[PDB]
């Protein structure tokens, strides 16, 4: 049988052995031969008495097959080696006679591609082509102030931007542009323009070594690193304040059996220890310093740390290296706001760039400051600020005084208005858990169709933190990662919707924003139009006791009466509707 190509199973001498009118086989022929032995005739035969089949192709009638195949290899090798030695000597003769002057005319200049990252605006057809798809009656039928279009979108997520996510969704491999964008996002490559170790260099450099990097080399140097540190993968503690799900810190309450050694502490801290414990502590000033000594008596309460090993070890985290500073968010903002707000701020500018609006104030050449809405929202909001105000404050760690305000689901939309938009539009922040983004579009549509706004930012954001991971695990909503490894599943293949062996969802983090407008205004401003929002409904379900149970309420978007459907309603026919207009 002949394997794949060249070296495998001595393929080079197959043509040689075949010249005796022996047959060699492809794998597809030898497969067909062997399935011949599962045909019912040969099966019936096997059951009468054992069946020996020779599929040898007559190769048994070649005497001294070892010697004969050795001879064929040696008759190819001598012929290849000769011609190589004659080719090497005509290449040397040619070198000597022509030097390297008549050999320099042969060498040609190659063009290595540079990433040229397009914004992938929609391709507008000629009017004739785009008049075909719609019926003629449409023209002048629609009120374009009541037609919602999506004009721009973005997202910050496990695969970076919407451009990079889309490459990995549709083609499961980065382009040149995709690699470069993912390398820039993750912080593997920074741009340099100036003198670099003497001579001047304009281009990408490795952000650590400051070594120049060509666009062609970015796939060779960083793709393995990019694919490792993006997407659904083992929870990296560096991204979650040293959260390690294998070592999850809790505290057990214990009663002191026998007294402790006295420790030093300030006056105020000792007075606080006294207030708490009452008689079960002794505080005594040390006159030398003025610093007091705290002594925990018998029957005092302590808290001893203990680690729990948790079984959710994988999440859809934002690519390691992602940093709001790369997009140009100042340190004064990064130190103030919850990490979720930084995903929203980037998603919002990156959506405005997708909509061809580099300076948001441009909007106010066309619409009042009261007509730009923010109809976007979250499920749980700034859960790092909740941790801060419930846990870190308890443990008397140093937390910002204003942590409360960073926690609120409506605070991301506040920072967006305060930093970028400066509208006085409607601000309708939905909370829909896993349906927040579709509720956002529902509200933002209802807001434009009511006249209260002409543009709305819509979409949704959520972060992944320690407390939420754990609580989704106690609700058994998320996939148990130990059970997944029992079943031999790698992280990447743990989110498997619609499959037999699906066993809970993969938690992720990030934001997605769309910009929607009236069509009338989109055409006026001349912004790209990526689609029309034809409908956006919400629905509850019914009487039950399970909050996480999904139901069939949204089925009401397809409600129609079908008692009397003998003759089609004229109201559905567009020619009629255009006539009555």
């Amino acid at each position: 049988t002949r394997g794949t190509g060249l070296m495998s199973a001595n393929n080079i001498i197959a043509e040689g052995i075949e010249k005796m009118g022996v047959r060699t086989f492809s794998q597809k022929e030898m497969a067909f031969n062997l399935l011949g032995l599962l045909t019912p005739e040969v099966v019936e035969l096997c059951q009468k008495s054992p069946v020996m089949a020779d599929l040898n192709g007559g190769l048994q009638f070649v005497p001294e097959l070892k010697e004969f195949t050795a001879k064929l290899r040696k008759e190819l090798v001598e012929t290849s080696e000769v011609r190589k030695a004659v080719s090497i000597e005509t290449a040397l003769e040619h070198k000597v006679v022509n030097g390297n002057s008549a050999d320099a005319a042969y060498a040609q200049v190659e063009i290595q591609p540079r990433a040229n990252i397009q914004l992938d605006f929609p391709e507008l057809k000629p009017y004739k082509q785009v008049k075909q798809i719609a019926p003629a009656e449409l023209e002048g039928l629609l009120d374009l102030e009541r037609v919602i279009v999506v004009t721009g979108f973005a997202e910050v997520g496990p695969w970076g931007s919407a451009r990079t996510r889309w490459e990995m969704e549709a083609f499961g491999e980065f382009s040149l542009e995709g690699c470069v964008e993912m390398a820039w996002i993750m912080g593997f490559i920074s741009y340099h323009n100036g003198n670099l170790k003497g001579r001047p260099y304009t281009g990408w450099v490795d952000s650590k070594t400051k070594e120049p990097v060509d666009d062609k080399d970015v796939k060779a140097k960083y793709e393995t690193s990019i694919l490792e540190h993006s997407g659904i993968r083992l929870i990296e503690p560096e991204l979650f304040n040293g959260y390690n799900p294998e070592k999850k810190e809790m505290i057990q309450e214990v009663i002191v059996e026998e007294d402790l050694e006295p420790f030093e502490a300030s006056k105020e801290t000792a007075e606080q220890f006294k207030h708490q414990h009452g008689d079960k502590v002794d505080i005594f000033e040390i006159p030398e310093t003025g610093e007091y000594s705290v002594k925990l008596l018998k029957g005092a309460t302590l808290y001893i740390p203990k680690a729990l090993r948790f079984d959710r070890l994988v999440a859809g985290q934002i690519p390691t290296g992602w940093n709001a500073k790369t997009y140009g968010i100042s340190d004064d903002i990064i130190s103030q706001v919850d990490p979720i707000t930084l995903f929203v701020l980037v998603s919002v500018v990156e959506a405005f760039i997708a909509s061809g609006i580099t300076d948001p104030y441009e909007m106010y050449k066309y619409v009042h400051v009261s007509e730009v809405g923010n109809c976007s929202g979250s499920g749980m909001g700034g859960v790092s600020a909740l941790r801060g105000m419930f846990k870190d404050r308890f443990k008397d760690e140093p937390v910002q005084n204003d942590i409360l305000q960073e926690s609120f689901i409506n605070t991301m939309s506040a920072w967006v208005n305060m930093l970028l938009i400066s509208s006085s539009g409607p601000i309708k922040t939905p909370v829909g858990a896993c349906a927040t983004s579709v509720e956002s579009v529902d509200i933002g549509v209802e807001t434009i169709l009511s006249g209260k706004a002409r543009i709305c930012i819509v979409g949704g954001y959520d972060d992944f933190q320690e407390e939420g991971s754990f609580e989704f695990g106690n609700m058994k909503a998320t996939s148990n990662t130990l059970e997944e490894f029992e079943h031999g599943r790698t992280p990447a293949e743990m989110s498997r919707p619609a499959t037999t062996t699906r066993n809970g969802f993969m938690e992720a983090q990030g934001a997605g924003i769309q910009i929607i407008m009236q069509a009338d205004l989109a055409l006026k401003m001349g912004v790209p139009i990526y689609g029309i929002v034809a409908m956006a409904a919400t629905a509850t379900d019914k009487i039950g006791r399970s909050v996480p149970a999904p139901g069939k309420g949204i089925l009401t978007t397809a409600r129609e009466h079908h008692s009397s459907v003998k003759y089609a309603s004229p109201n559905l026919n567009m020619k009629y509707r255009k006539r009555q207009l």
Binding site: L138, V441, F505, A508, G531, A536
Partner: protein
């Protein structure tokens, strides 16, 4: 005029119990229920949700008499991203817009083996590899939150809008768009290499003296300041006769 166009073009089905909200939505642009090509399912990889959702879409399509042998092509984007809760539908919506404008439908590459229970839903197809179509006309986006939140958005291919304007208005549009795409590309590459895509505003487009005047004048608009080069409200263009 607008109210008439609204009465006959847009909201012809709001009062009619014989027309679904999902049917009227497509019918507006002359699409039928069969033109809905792709459903971007919530599709969390949970037992309850993924069956429930398939059964829901199937029953919608069956009651609106979608053609037998014409299933919606389910798109489970969470095989790649996981489930970000609040942001879930926003990611779906972005990938729906990227499906419409390319006609590429991404496949669920973790669809090893489609649940046998989902075969009873003949109006849904679960691809495992990316299809390059000739075009997608509309995309459904279905989310199901905790606390009985269910949502559905329909998004229609943006070419169905341009057939509702004149050739002069469309060509004006296309000229403006090309101008804006070039300026946006310029801004993008400059902001990328110099880490300045995001630029916080220092000031409102109005000073604090004009703030109340700009709020109270509905026809107040901004204009390039000759000095600073920035778009600001200008006292002269607030409560203006012009």
């Amino acid at each position: 005029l607008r109210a008439a166009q609204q009465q006959w073009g847009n909201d012809f089905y709001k009062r009619d119990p014989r027309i679904a909200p999902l049917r009227g939505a497509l019918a507006t642009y002359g699409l039928t229920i069969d033109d809905l090509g792709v459903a971007s399912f919530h599709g969390t990889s949970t037992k309850a949700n993924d069956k429930n959702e398939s059964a829901t879409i199937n029953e919608m399509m069956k009651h609106l008499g979608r053609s037998e042998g014409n299933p919606v092509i389910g798109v489970f984007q969470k095989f790649l991203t996981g489930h970000p809760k609040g942001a879930a539908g926003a990611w779906m919506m972005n990938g729906a817009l990227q499906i419409l404008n390319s006609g590429i439908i991404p496949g669920n590459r973790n669809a090893d083996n489609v649940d046998k229970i989902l075969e009873q839903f003949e109006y849904v197809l679960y691809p495992s590899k990316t299809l390059k179509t000739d075009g997608v006309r509309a995309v459904s986006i279905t989310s199901f939150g905790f606390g009985q939140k269910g949502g559905q958005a329909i998004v229609v291919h943006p070419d169905y809008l341009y057939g509702a304007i004149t050739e002069d208005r469309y060509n004006e549009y296309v000229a403006k768009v090309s101008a804006r795409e070039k300026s946006a590309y310029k801004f993008f590459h400059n902001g990328m290499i110099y880490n300045k895509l995001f630029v916080s505003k220092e000031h409102a487009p109005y000073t604090d003296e004009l703030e109340e005047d700009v709020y109270l004048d509905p026809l107040a608009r901004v204009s390039k300041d000759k000095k600073s080069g920035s778009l600001t409200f200008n006292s002269k263009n607030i409560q203006s006769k012009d």
